[PDB]
């Protein structure tokens, strides 16, 4: 793949991979990344700073405030009024100017400004948010905490009730709690009136209170977030809580019931003699078609067409691609088309598998899932390879150094019988250190640094009234956090279809150390 073809390529992720490729390897001249801005489907991450290496344009600042940028905090009181407040966006420049000149802006901008005004003032005092807390500006609590996370104080309940109004919020309440930080912040974040949150900053909220062992308002925060989720899983993971705590069992038969396939829901149908739900079955009898199912630009085109569909299209998609050469595809187009009611489990290229202990199947097949769907072509937004999900560093070494694959290639990845291969390989070395197929896919996501960082602290899958489940809402990476429970309950499932049954209950006893 010469520039020049990748050139005459749709827009895509496969494009910006191959891209990647030649610019990692050196082979894209000046002249060739001159029209190549244009060419590149996602312009974040590596290829924008590789990219960068070759053309530094860092641009842009707008036309018509570009007087703006020529004044520093020395000169500031020479520029236009319009100036003034440009630069007066950024906390650090503020930071930056003296008290006088602060004092002096500060003063200009009180009639129309009052934001500025209010932390020019606060930069006067050895405590800026002390400052902006005592004035209940909203706007400026949180450009403060942007500029510094350092800042903690108690907030009263007028002023902590007036935080989830704005758009800084969630993501606020989420790092602080998940993190452990701002100590004085999350235990006046108790006092939020769960009428005042919703969904996830809810849900938050209640784990929040479970940590200071306020279980009453835990439940309210727990409920709100309940009524509030617009995914019936999220739902289902806070009535869980609801039922954790107070127990009522009209709580736990709706989570029984839940349409959702999910570890609370599974765990809800087996502690109530539920039986395991349905599990659709896909046997296509139509052997093959066209199709490459090696070719990551068809996978692109493909992915594009099921996205931007409807009635009429995604019935002649399932039609086509009901082969079991495309059965991944057709799973994939049947998850959309029945709006995600429909439970699909295949285990394409068995052969592969067929071999190992049904328990390493059910975890393969768990992780494939999660990670692609069992398309072999797919590649992510951190140009991740195949159906198991590879970083192009890990699929080089286990290629090239361990298991010495004759003239490997990365792209090797996006077969089969090898991501499978290699996801067996590094499933054996993250089980035989951690056990649980539950931390295994939390390493399997974010590494077993972290993992095992996680598992050393004493405040995590130890031993306590709401453990494990508490621990698992205490993930510190958000995207670890989903992974591990998403593929925890793919792996039930699949042990279930391979006639290897495990309780989840047994799985939530082993968590705890
Ligand atoms: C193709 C893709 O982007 N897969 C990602 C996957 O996205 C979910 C996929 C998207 O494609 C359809 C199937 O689920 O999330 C994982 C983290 O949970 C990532 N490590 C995977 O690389």
Not at 317 to 346: G, V
Not at 473 to 490: C, D, F, H, M, T
């Amino acid at each position: 793949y010469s520039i020049e073809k990748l050139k005459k390529e749709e827009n895509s992720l496969a494009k910006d991979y191959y891209i990647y490729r030649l610019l990692e390897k050196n082979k894209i001249s000046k002249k060739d990344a001159q029209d190549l801005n244009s060419h590149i489907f996602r312009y974040i991450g590596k290829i924008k700073s590789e990219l960068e290496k070759i053309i530094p344009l860092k641009p842009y600042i707008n036309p018509k405030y570009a007087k703006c940028y020529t004044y520093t905090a020395n000169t500031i009181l020479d520029a236009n009024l319009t100036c003034q407040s440009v630069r007066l966006n950024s906390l650090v420049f503020i930071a930056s100017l003296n008290s006088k000149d602060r004092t002096t802006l500060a003063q200009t901008f009180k009639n129309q400004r009052p934001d500025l005004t209010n932390l020019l003032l606060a930069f006067n005092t050895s405590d800026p948010m002390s400052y902006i807390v005592q004035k209940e500006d909203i706007n400026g609590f949180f450009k403060l905490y942007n500029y510094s996370k350092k800042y903690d104080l108690d907030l009263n309940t007028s002023l902590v009730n007036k935080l989830p109004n704005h758009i800084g919020f969630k993501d606020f309440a989420q790092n602080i709690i998940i993190k452990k930080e701002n100590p004085k912040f999350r235990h006046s974040m108790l006092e939020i009136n769960p009428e005042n949150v919703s969904e996830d900053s809810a849900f938050y909220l209640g784990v929040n209170a479970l940590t200071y062992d306020k279980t009453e308002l835990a439940y309210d925060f727990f409920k709100k977030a309940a009524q509030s989720f617009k995914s019936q899983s999220n739902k289902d993971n806070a009535i869980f809580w609801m039922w954790l705590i107070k127990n009522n069992e009209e709580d736990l038969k709706t989570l029984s019931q839940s349409s959702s396939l999910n570890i609370y829901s599974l765990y809800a149908k087996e502690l109530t003699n539920t039986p395991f739900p349905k599990i659709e079955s896909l046997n296509p009898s139509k052997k093959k078609n066209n199709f490459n199912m090696q070719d990551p630009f068809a996978w692109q085109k493909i992915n594009k067409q099921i996205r931007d569909a409807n009635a009429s299209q995604l019935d002649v998609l399932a039609k086509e691609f009901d082969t079991q050469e495309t059965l991944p595809i057709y799973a994939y187009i049947l998850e959309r088309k029945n709006n995600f009611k429909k439970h699909y489990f295949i285990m394409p290229y068995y052969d592969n598998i067929k071999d190992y202990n049904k328990t390493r199947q059910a975890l393969i097949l768990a992780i494939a899932r999660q990670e692609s769907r069992f398309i072999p072509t797919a590649i992510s937004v951190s140009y991740a390879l195949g159906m198991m999900q590879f970083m192009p560093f890990l699929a080089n070494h286990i290629g090239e150094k361990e298991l010495k694959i004759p003239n490997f290639d990365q792209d090797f990845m996006f077969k089969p019988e090898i991501a499978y291969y290699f996801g067996n390989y590094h499933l054996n070395y993250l089980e035989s250190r951690l056990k649980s197929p539950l931390f295994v896919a939390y390493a399997y996501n974010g590494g077993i640094g972290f993992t095992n960082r996680m598992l050393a602290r004493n405040d995590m899958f130890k031993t306590g009234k709401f453990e494990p489940f508490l621990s698992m809402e205490l993930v510190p990476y958000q995207e670890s956090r989903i992974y591990g429970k998403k593929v925890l309950a793919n792996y039930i499932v699949y042990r279930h279809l391979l006639n290897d049954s495990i309780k989840i209950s047994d799985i939530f006893e082993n968590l705890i150390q």
